[PDB]
């Protein structure tokens with residue numbers, strides 16, 4: 286049975302849609318040629334990081350009043366330290382063909398993102414906004430801007446750089462920001478005003494890595510694609526555009542995107558929109574969330590680490606350790622180690638010494654007077 | 657704890673222990689006819705105790 290091709294009109298071939306729903310849907314088993322899109326969002330984290338707090342949630346997506354202290358040193362509080370936002374999406378397991386030593390992982394192709402809530406900035410009538418002049422309207426949200434987002438299969442690799450090492454950031458006490466002092470274990474040295482390779486940290490928590498001190502390390506982030514922007518000014522205007530047609534491609538120069546290690550999609554973003562000028566003259570930053578529509582596909586890969594080496598490397602650590610006399614390292618208790626293979630004609634010197642050159646070829650040592 | 661079993665990685669299969677049938681019984685049921693325990697409440701005067709119920 287089949288319909289008449291002439292009697293029946295033809296239509297286009299759009300990609301077939303299997304399912305549309307929430308997070309509980311990713312569990313669906315899909316073929317090797319399937320494609321996944323995830324629409325999600327991240328609220329900003331700028332010191333006031335929770336609306337559930339009964340006392341101080343009036344300033345969610347805001348900071349407390351920013352002021353220079355006036356006397357060294359500086360002691361800023363967490364509520365004045367806006368930090369990056371981050372989240373992880375757990376992806377389902379996939380097949381593997383151990384016979385060919387190849388498995389398959391998720392990769393990201395494209396992300397469709399846009400800053401949400403831009404329309405809310407035209408509110409020039411917040412009851413405490415500083416009038417630009419007498420009998421006038423409010424000073425629109427403007428000034429400093431910082432925008433970045435990062436997509437990768439690993440947590441984003443960061444770099445530490447602070448405008449002044451004299452500042453003393455709050456200590457990490459089971460909560461609170463994490464600063465270079467927390468990573469190194471020492472007070473910040475004036476090297477940190479420049480680039481210090483010692484000051485590096487993976488982005489592991491939300492709202493705990495302030496933007497003032499951390500910046501994306503360009504060296505290590507090879508498995509992540511991050512984009513940035515900034516403008517600094519007293520009351521310079523903020524400009525933003527938005528649409529749902531602009532998409533961004535994440536493939537590299539070699540044709541691969543970020544590979545989700547641990548079947549986890551790592552996302553990080555941060556968007557400052559400007560100041561909130563108050564009648565008191567006091568000032569405070571502000572932010573607003575970000576929209577993400579990451580597209581994912583299935584890519585086959587070859588296991589780089591052969592399983593056998595992992596097995597022994599695993600149980601050895603699990604097996605009870607053995608604290609014997611040192612047999613490796615600086616104080617090894619080993620004197621000679623010889624290695625034989627095959628038969629050769631008898632050489633003259635029985636005290637001969639041979640080794641392998643830096644190029645892997647066989648070499649015979651010519652004896653020399655040891656000083 | 658049951659012992660380990662064989663496996664076949666090439667065919668991606670292995671062995672697992674399957675419980676197919678179980679025979680059960682309650683032990684000590686006969687012990688319930690003891691109506692003579694030195695502190696059992698008599699069912700009536702000059703009578704016997706109240707069986708476990």
Ligand SMILES: [Ca+2]
Nearest residue numbers: 504505506507
């Ligand atoms: Ca590198």
